[PDB]
């Protein structure tokens, strides 16, 4: 059973990429056609002639002549019988305690098809994007693998829907945050239901904005809608009964992009006081903590919750400060944990796109990331560990590889390449870390591959040191257990005595410095050379510019020497 499967996807988003990994790593073939026009979707089915069509992420209705000719399965982010385009938004706005995902056949009426598989799960009070990236994606993977088994046996009959309900597209009026009428929990619900799209509309300091990435505040209080403090470019705003932090906003203009709240609001904030909290401080009330540092059992853990996994120049320097602090503590190991949803995705393209000179900000950002990487590498007397709870890509993958040990949760998706951002050369000392892990030949193959790999595949090829745990929490618990065991063994003290010798030698230090210099000269060419392929790719990505065809690297049915 080696099937030829066609994905229909609005964008090749995280769910599409997770399912791509699960299917191709089982030796099925997956071709992708992006959702551009029904005529293109029809042409792609006729060109590729799939065994099976899966639609992980649909915008347009599938043309009748496709799904009447090829078995076509649709992913719906709600339990059986739920119908409509904003299933998750409604489930969060309504406060459902149980939700689910359904794999169902295409049909004439919207979301009416017979059910092939479904999974249910308890709801978290959390951002829509986090539900989609964790509970929904894990459930969808189980549905799809189950349906491939059913499909190959050949006598499967799906289950028609009995009871069902329809929720229309959710309107902004329902999402809009009113600082006077809404208590903190209501603000949270509205932002969570709208994050990472379309955002919850609001007014702040006179500006019509969309709100993203909210956190409750318990100490600071004031008048509803008053800005009470600034902290790492997040703003804290009074609610009816309290206060809420908003880390990111987007103005409601055509050209505008999602940015840290301080950069959107700008001069309007003049006079607000920064309310700093160091990551290593203990607080016993709820508040916004971008970076958290905690010690347990001789291990120092650094959580860094950078929105979208994107690390701006300033977030890099804040992370560096915390690594430096940790390296002065009496810990045996330092563990970089990122956030539950992302380890890191590299440079912050939005803050780069927003800068007066994108090229100068790119140069600032890559040097900031490399300063973090350098500090990690030059840690002679402690174990360094990257714990990837969530996806990673571009410079974020190579940040992890500077750690002595790299572990990832099961189901993490990796993009260890730059082919989506204008073929950047990359830095982060990859010319040192990558061949030490896979060899030069395979390392070059890894960075030429534009398609994603799973953390299981990354472990099998030697790119990372282990993969375990189904959820972020389970992964953190097994990670701590495994590190705790190592640092309490004789093997750890032998290892540190060797590392102390290697990482203080002049030879090793000149080696890593030469790798940084050579990488940065290439990135300098990328950022400033006459070829501006990097800037062009960044513009299309940050601005979400639409596609007018499916590139051949996605569409196998549209490659030059394609036949049969």
Residue numbers in the entry: -1 to 562
Question: What sentences appear in the manuscript?
Answer:
HypX will catalyze two consecutive reactions, the formyl-group transfer from N10-formyl-THF to CoA and decarbonylation of formyl-CoA, in the N- and C-terminal domains, respectively, to produce CO. The putative catalytic residues, His74, Asp80, and Asp109 in the N-terminal domain and Ty416 and Glu426 in the C-terminal domain, are perfectly conserved among HypX homologs listed in the previous report. CoA is constitutively bound in HypX, which will act as the prosthetic group for CO biosynthesis through the formation and the decarbonylation of formyl-CoA. CO produced by HypX is used as a ligand of the iron in the NiFe(CN)2(CO) center of NiFe hydrogenases.
We prepared and determined the crystal structures of variants in which mutations were introduced at amino acid residues interacting with CoA to elucidate physiological roles of these residues. Further mutations on Ser194, Gln195, and Asn306, which interact with 3’-phosphate group of CoA, resulted in a decrease of CoA binding affinity. The Q15A-R131A-S194A-Q195A-N306A-R542A variant showed two MS peaks due to apo (CoA-free) and holo (CoA-bound) form in native MS analysis while only holo form was observed in wild-type. Thus, a loss of hydrogen bonds with 3’-phosphate group of CoA decreases CoA binding affinity of HypX and these hydrogen bonds play an important role for tethering CoA in the cavity.
